[PDB]
Amino acid sequence: DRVLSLPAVSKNQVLENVFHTAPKAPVEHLEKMVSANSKVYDALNLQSKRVLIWQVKPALF
Amino acid sequence: LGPQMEALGASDLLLSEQIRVITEHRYTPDRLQYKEGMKLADKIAAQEAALKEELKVIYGDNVDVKHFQASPRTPVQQLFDSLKNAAANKERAAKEAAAAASPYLAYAVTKKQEVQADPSNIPFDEVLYPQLSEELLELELSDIREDEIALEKA
Amino acid sequence: KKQATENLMKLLQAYKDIGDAKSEPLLKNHNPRTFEDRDYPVPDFRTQNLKAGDVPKFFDTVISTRASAAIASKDKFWAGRKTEAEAASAKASAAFPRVAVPEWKKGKTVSIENLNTVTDKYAAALVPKRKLALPVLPEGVKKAVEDFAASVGQ
Amino acid sequence: IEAEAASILDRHLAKPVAQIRKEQASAYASLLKRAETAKGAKWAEKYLEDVKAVQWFDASVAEAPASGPKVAA
């Protein structure tokens, strides 16, 4: 019964109770907010190719 | 002993494929420690796939992941592997900032490469969290100490 | 949802400053080995009337029972820590920085010199809070020593 | 009309983006095919001519976004 003096918590259980969640990378915030502020740039700049300012306040020719 | 004639990190097989044969040798498939060793082999193989994906952009497709699993790269070699692709990285970032659909996206990709190609911006967990890194060292030193306590009891 | 996020962030700050008031190690309480009772009376298999194939099942039952007790002790510890930090997340400061998003007023439009600075605030969070100053050698110094080595014919 | 617009927007800002894109693309595709299966009707030719005029508006503001659409004055 040598096995009953070893720690009963396996190395698997340590590795799954210590690294429980896959941690958030810091570049995920950058790439997500950049891919959404590209849409903020596209709609709302006055130099984008697809501005909303002519679909919203049309013109007066 | 068979597969246990060489240490856990000192074979030619990968570490997870060594956990697999050690656990197949020490235990029959109906044991508890068999299942826990195969689950540990799954965790270690996940770490190996993560390290292969982290290194394949530098060392090729035949990345030889066992050499870096056994002996990880020193911070000096992390520097000198960030410096030997920095020309290709800057040319890729220039060729991608030229072909971005926006001056915003072009500034974003050149700023991401400006903050990424700097080798001082590699996040080292041993510098960031010293206490956590030494506890992660002691998590494996304690398993080896439990095996040594069993061998000194025998 | 914003109040729930602010409550969760006050909760994580409460967890951190009552994990640092006790000054305890980081991986001590997520490791279920530290909640394992090492000095339990360790049941003798010779006084349980086992047959031939029944001894490894007895060892598996003893090991898994003691591991489940260690995991449940870990869970009771974290229930106690959760109430101890719920009691301190109430009386807090809640002065957090806000997520940097570009300025967009109601009738107006965003300027690229504000999208660019929120991109700079994103890429300023990619540097680590403590980093090694790995000295990259500039071309102006490696050439100022390379021509010096070329002066003596080496 | 303000209450209907705010209700439609707050029901729309509860979706994820891929759901929004495939819903609007599916509705636009169905409404194009309902006017393309109409052949010979005057409203169908006027419908597709106005679709092409909207595409002209988009191309013309893509050509010069500070000046607006090109108006031959």
Side-chain angles (χ1 to χ4, degrees):
Chain A
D1 43 356
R2 281 292 193 224
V3 75
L4 305 188
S5 291
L6 291 189
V9 174
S10 300
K11 184 61 162 199
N12 174 40
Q13 287 189 3
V14 177
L15 281 193
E16 86 186 8
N17 284 248
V18 159
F19 310 134
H20 43 88
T21 313
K24 294 260 197 187
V27 78
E28 188 213 1
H29 186 74
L30 189 138
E31 62 190 295
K32 276 185 148 300
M33 300 299 273
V34 159
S35 59
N37 295 353
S38 69
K39 282 143 54 167
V40 180
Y41 169 78
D42 281 16
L44 305 160
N45 198 59
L46 273 302
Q47 280 93 18
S48 177
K49 294 309 163 210
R50 325 172 286 145
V51 207
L52 292 204
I53 199 64
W54 315 112
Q55 330 188 355
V56 153
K57 287 270 174 46
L60 269 193
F61 275 91
Chain B
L1 283 183
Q4 312 193 57
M5 290 303 298
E6 49 200 5
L8 197 53
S11 169
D12 77 297
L13 297 108
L14 262 55
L15 175 57
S16 70
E17 283 299 332
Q18 196 178 341
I19 294 292
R20 230 169 284 275
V21 299
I22 294 309
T23 316
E24 187 49 77
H25 174 73
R26 296 191 197 166
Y27 315 101
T28 57
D30 57 291
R31 298 299 300 279
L32 186 79
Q33 289 83 232
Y34 187 85
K35 305 156 182 173
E36 301 286 327
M38 295 308 171
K39 290 159 178 172
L40 172 62
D42 285 340
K43 303 270 193 49
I44 297 306
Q47 299 187 36
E48 294 218 63
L51 193 53
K52 176 205 209 67
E53 194 178 7
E54 199 159 331
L55 286 177
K56 62 160 175 46
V57 294
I58 298 166
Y59 288 89
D61 190 287
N62 281 159
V63 66
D64 200 287
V65 63
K66 167 64 186 50
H67 165 232
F68 304 101
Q69 181 176 40
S71 61
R73 295 140 76 221
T74 50
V76 179
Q77 196 59 222
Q78 294 199 51
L79 167 64
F80 282 93
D81 284 310
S82 69
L83 294 196
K84 79 183 218 174
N85 293 356
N89 277 5
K90 216 175 60 172
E91 290 178 355
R92 173 152 31 99
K95 282 153 54 173
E96 209 189 353
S102 297
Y104 177 68
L105 287 174
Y107 182 85
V109 297
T110 192
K111 186 67 174 196
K112 173 149 60 166
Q113 198 264 356
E114 187 159 356
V115 80
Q116 271 187 324
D118 189 60
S120 173
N121 287 149
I122 313 179
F124 294 140
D125 269 310
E126 51 263 31
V127 190
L128 283 165
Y129 317 104
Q131 197 184 355
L132 156 73
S133 68
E134 73 184 4
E135 283 166 70
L136 275 174
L137 177 66
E138 293 193 332
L139 277 189
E140 299 196 353
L141 294 202
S142 275
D143 191 5
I144 296 179
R145 182 52 190 167
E146 283 295 324
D147 292 336
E148 204 182 43
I149 279 174
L151 293 190
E152 88 171 11
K153 278 182 159 178
Chain C
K1 292 180 178 196
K2 170 192 154 183
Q3 195 59 42
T5 303
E6 195 177 353
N7 284 5
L8 276 158
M9 267 194 254
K10 284 191 306 176
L11 200 52
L12 299 195
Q13 190 57 235
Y15 277 137
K16 182 169 175 181
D17 52 16
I18 79 179
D20 292 334
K22 309 202 179 305
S23 74
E24 57 186 348
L26 286 157
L27 295 184
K28 180 183 173 184
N29 307 118
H30 296 290
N31 190 10
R33 302 269 193 88
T34 60
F35 304 97
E36 205 193 352
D37 194 351
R38 306 294 278 137
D39 306 333
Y40 215 71
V42 56
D44 213 337
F45 77 107
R46 312 174 190 104
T47 74
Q48 306 284 115
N49 306 343
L50 286 316
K51 201 171 287 295
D54 290 28
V55 163
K57 185 207 165 186
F58 175 81
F59 286 156
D60 293 355
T61 302
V62 163
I63 285 171
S64 67
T65 296
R66 195 175 59 189
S68 308
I71 283 170
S73 190
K74 173 195 181 302
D75 295 0
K76 191 192 69 65
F77 176 78
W78 277 112
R81 181 74 84 205
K82 183 156 191 179
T83 71
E84 197 189 334
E86 282 285 331
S89 57
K91 30 180 177 64
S93 176
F96 302 115
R98 291 298 181 257
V99 179
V101 293
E103 289 292 329
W104 177 35
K105 306 191 150 312
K106 191 190 292 288
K108 265 67 62 179
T109 46
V110 314
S111 52
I112 211 174
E113 62 257 14
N114 187 242
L115 294 154
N116 282 350
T117 78
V118 301
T119 307
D120 296 356
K121 285 177 173 181
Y122 298 150
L126 280 188
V127 304
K129 317 155 296 182
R130 177 188 297 145
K131 54 195 152 313
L132 276 180
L134 291 88
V136 64
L137 209 59
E139 297 292 324
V141 174
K142 74 178 291 296
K143 198 43 201 166
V145 304
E146 186 170 12
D147 55 4
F148 197 90
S151 179
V152 303
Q154 285 188 358
Chain D
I1 289 304
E2 288 185 357
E4 180 171 18
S7 176
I8 285 173
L9 187 73
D10 300 347
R11 198 175 320 124
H12 167 271
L13 295 183
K15 311 179 202 273
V17 189
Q19 174 175 172
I20 285 175
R21 294 201 179 113
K22 89 171 304 305
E23 275 177 349
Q24 295 189 339
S26 173
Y28 173 78
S30 176
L31 263 168
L32 265 180
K33 194 260 289 182
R34 209 192 314 162
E36 274 168 345
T37 189
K39 296 185 289 293
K42 180 57 167 310
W43 75 270
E45 321 166 10
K46 277 291 184 159
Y47 210 76
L48 301 181
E49 197 271 328
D50 288 316
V51 172
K52 187 169 70 175
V54 165
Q55 293 167 342
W56 177 88
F57 191 90
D58 293 332
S60 176
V61 299
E63 279 166 5
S67 297
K70 297 204 61 177
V71 173

